[PDB]
Amino acid sequence: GDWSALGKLLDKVQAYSTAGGKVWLSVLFIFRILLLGTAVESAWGDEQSAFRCNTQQPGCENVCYDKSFPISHVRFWVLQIIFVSVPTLLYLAHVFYVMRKEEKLNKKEEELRGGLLRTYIISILFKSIFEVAFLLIQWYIYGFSLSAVYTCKRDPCPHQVDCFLSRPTEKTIFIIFMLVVSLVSLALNIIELFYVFFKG
Amino acid sequence: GDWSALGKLLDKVQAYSTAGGKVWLSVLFIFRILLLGTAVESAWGDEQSAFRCNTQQPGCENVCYDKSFPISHVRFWVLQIIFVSVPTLLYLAHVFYVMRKEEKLNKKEEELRGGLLRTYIISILFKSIFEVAFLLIQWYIYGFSLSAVYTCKRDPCPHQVDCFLSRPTEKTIFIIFMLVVSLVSLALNIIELFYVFFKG
Amino acid sequence: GDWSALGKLLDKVQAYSTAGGKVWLSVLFIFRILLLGTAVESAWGDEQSAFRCNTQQPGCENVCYDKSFPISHVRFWVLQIIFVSVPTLLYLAHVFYVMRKEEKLNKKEEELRGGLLRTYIISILFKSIFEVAFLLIQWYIYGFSLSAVYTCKRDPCPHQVDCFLSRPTEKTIFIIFMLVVSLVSLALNIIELFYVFFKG
Amino acid sequence: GDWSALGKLLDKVQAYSTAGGKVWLSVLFIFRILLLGTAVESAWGDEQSAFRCNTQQPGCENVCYDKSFPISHVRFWVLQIIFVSVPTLLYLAHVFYVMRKEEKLNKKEEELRGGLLRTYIISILFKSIFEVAFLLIQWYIYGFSLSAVYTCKRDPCPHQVDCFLSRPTEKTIFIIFMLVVSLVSLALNIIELFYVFFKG
Amino acid sequence: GDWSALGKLLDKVQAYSTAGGKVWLSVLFIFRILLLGTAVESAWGDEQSAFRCNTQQPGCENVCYDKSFPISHVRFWVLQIIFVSVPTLLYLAHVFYVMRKEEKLNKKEEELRGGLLRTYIISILFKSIFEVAFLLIQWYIYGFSLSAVYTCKRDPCPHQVDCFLSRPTEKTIFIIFMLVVSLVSLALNIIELFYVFFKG
Amino acid sequence: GDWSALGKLLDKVQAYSTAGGKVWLSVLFIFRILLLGTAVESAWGDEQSAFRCNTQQPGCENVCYDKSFPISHVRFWVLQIIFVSVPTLLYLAHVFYVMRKEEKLNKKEEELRGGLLRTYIISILFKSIFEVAFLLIQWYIYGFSLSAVYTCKRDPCPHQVDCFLSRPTEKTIFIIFMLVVSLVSLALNIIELFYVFFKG
């Protein structure tokens, strides 16, 4: 039975916000890592092996596929998850080490509202900023639909060449799904901030 | 020995319905995740690599396969499992945190039928609604049989083109099996609701 | 040390039959899941990628392979294992919850031969019925040998076409092995039933 | 700390033979499962995909490869390991359940050289019989060398056809290695039997 | 509960530097092993299978790809992680064994600033030296950009041959990312060294 | 808390040699199994699928690749690790069982420098002999460099045939690295032997 020194750590860190701010923030565990690990990875399996362009010329397929996709979507969502997860991790590390230093303190000098809310709201605004920045980068690069026919105009390919993607509809549905989950996570992060700021 | 603080949590949450409502609801653990993970995933392995259409034209295979399958069945059942699992998870989280708050309560202020049934029946009706919605979407999109010959009439393919699927009979049997398991889960969810409503 | 509340559960459930009924029923753990997971799965690896028919016509290979194999053997044995495992699991769940209810009972009202054999023999006869039904379905569908040459007579293939399977001898040996293990499991299940019925 | 109820079980079962009979019988754990799992499995990876015969005729490759290899060596060694491991497992199960019944006994009726050596020598002679039977079957089927050129004379291939195997030298070395390990295990099993029989 | 004999070991080793030197040195766990294991490995999947040069001559592709890539980037970053991780590991091993010897000491002879900072700064300067050496080797070998067209002038290829790489943009982005993480790790390692040297 | 009966076993076995003999012998755990499992395995992935010889004749590629590589390097290093690891394992097993027999002894008969150094130096000299034997076998078979062009003169290939290997430079670097690690392990094993022999 060694689940006590960790039970108090979570009750101290979860005492700030509303309980709805924690019991609705499980979508980072059930809707993000699970969906990226299980289903949507296999849809991007045969990416380059099924891309085909209508040309006799050798080597045009590689440069046209490069111009179509600067960076595939699954690595993009992995970078989004990594760059969003980090402030919560450093916040938990700082809070746990401050708690451990004070737990060492009262047994080393007492044998005879603070900066935590500031760090908390800093982490929340950083999460919001990174989420809206990644959403704007995706809206600028790709849009939220994929056409089955792409027109390629790159060297050393002759004038205009047509290329056909692999499985566009399923990728469209999954792009829309990740967009909806990201927007819901954004609104959920701003709602608890409004709740805490109107509590004080 | 640390299996006591979790033994009471399950006896409190399982005290509402009949024991048959729990000991028959193991099919989410034995018939859904096991069957999707072990057997039926390997049947959808060589999906695009064995699809073939009878045409000399380049790139017609991709668009005809896209028009045949907007979304493959295994990702559809994964989305069904995820969208059905979530209400039970949030119900357990809310009940455990209410129990933890009241366990903190009686040691913080006593040293000197409720909303749970409402949340329970809300979760059960949400499970039923999502199950019948997914079944109706599958009945509208695909039907419950697969033909070996498909007729494709999409650009830029010439007039009419024939395509042959890969392994239709085994996929037909597994579609029928998942349909039967979904219907049995639906009837099982409504039976305990009738039992609880006629208990009170 | 938390292996006491589980040690009594197994001694209560194993008290009914002979000890030989349990120490010989480990073949579901050593001969079924191990053999299907380790060796015989890799033999059915290159199933469709090595099937070949002797025709110039496109798309005849898929329909002839479909007519040869309605459902491959490894998914069939997986369905057999799943449909045989379930009565033991529900029997253990019912017995454990009855034991837990009575363990709660004698501490809630005593502070101041039964239905189990019926459920047991019901589970045993269900196991026997499912085993002999799966064996008869396999004897009706495939037989217990495989020829290297198959004659295919399906549309849109011309008149008669010959196809050659991949690795028939190893699959024949493994089919014979699973048949022998299934028959031994059947006789082993009926022997303990005779022993218990002649005990009483 | 729950490693006491298992420490006595091993001291009781290891009290019969010499300590060298146990500390040298770790080759079933370090030399058999490790070597089959790690190194020698990858050598039989591209078995059928690199087999090639010198003929224009379609479908001759499959039947000539079938006639060359009735059953590949890795599944053969897996069957050898499984059919050798089982007597030790049933011996441990019987000894542990007899020990548990007698541990229940002296607390249920005493509150106010035997059959084990027979079962032990039966298990040892069964291990020896199965080892020498598998070695004789391998000596009858394959021999202990592989030629790079095979002559195939099977229907419907024309008269005589030549086929070339993939990587024969590495497979020869591993066949010789498994033969040496099997012979050493045989001599090691018979030495402890002689030691125990000359002890009594 | 066995997390005490390890809790003191970490408080002794983390007592030297600032807490920011440890809570910011988690990037070896969250940004290095995770990113190399999950995302960037799959980008270097189809390396040789998509490399193509524009020549009729057999075997020119292998030597031109060899001259383009002496060693691929993922094995290079793996060697960097391994050669950077080792001084911290030997430092922890030496400190733990010195602590264990002194813990044995005061119970064996007392029943009736030191070399650690030197070893610490030695490990830190070794980490800095290896990081800047690997960065200079990568700047000398490859540069920090990749062109889609490579000119190959090696035997036995005729005069000048052109080759096209696979997915250059995504690899460029990941090269820039690993460069930024390495520079940040370098500055972070030198900052705590300045902090400790100006503390004393 | 069950890490005491194992803490004394390691302090008894590590009491013989210097602490540097143990804290520097972690390279079997950090530099051998990790490097073989993670990086260098993927370099030998596409071995046979990229080997190509310049001939129109069928089946010459297999015999020329066989004559080039009698046994690939990764299985060779796996055999080296297995044949080096075993003396330490049997030494630990013998020491632990002697310690367990004497721990049973003083509680069974006392209720009212030795052979260990000989076994230790035997294990060390066996490790040295096996290391230098494997290094001499590798120096005799392959040398420590690989040429991109191989000349093959085997039946039934016509007179002289040229073959081109896949990725020779990276394999050269990894061969040199494993050679350096093996030589460092050899010198490290002989240094502690000199230290112990000059201690006594």
UniProtKB/Swiss-Prot annotation, chains A, B, C, D, E, F:
Residues 1-22 are cytoplasmic. Changing A43V: In EKVP3; loss of localization to the plasma membrane, retention in the Golgi apparatus. The modification Phosphoserine is found at S4. GO terms for biological process: atrial cardiac muscle cell action potential; bone development; bone remodeling; cardiac conduction system development; cell communication by electrical coupling; cell communication by electrical coupling involved in cardiac conduction; cell-cell signaling; cellular response to amyloid-beta. Disulfide bonds join C53-C157, C152-C163. Belongs to the connexin family. Alpha-type (group II) subfamily. It is linked to Oculodentodigital dysplasia: A disease characterized by a typical facial appearance and variable involvement of the eyes, dentition, and fingers. Characteristic facial features include a narrow, pinched nose with hypoplastic alae nasi, prominent columella and thin anteverted nares together with a narrow nasal bridge, and prominent epicanthic folds giving the impression of hypertelorism. The teeth are usually small and carious. Typical eye findings include microphthalmia and microcornea. Gap junction protein that acts as a regulator of bladder capacity. A gap junction consists of a cluster of closely packed pairs of transmembrane channels, the connexons, through which materials of low MW diffuse from one cell to a neighboring cell. May play a critical role in the physiology of hearing by participating in the recycling of potassium to the cochlear endolymph. Negative regulator of bladder functional capacity: acts by enhancing intercellular electrical and chemical transmission, thus sensitizing bladder muscles to cholinergic neural stimuli and causing them to contract. This is Gap junction alpha-1 protein.
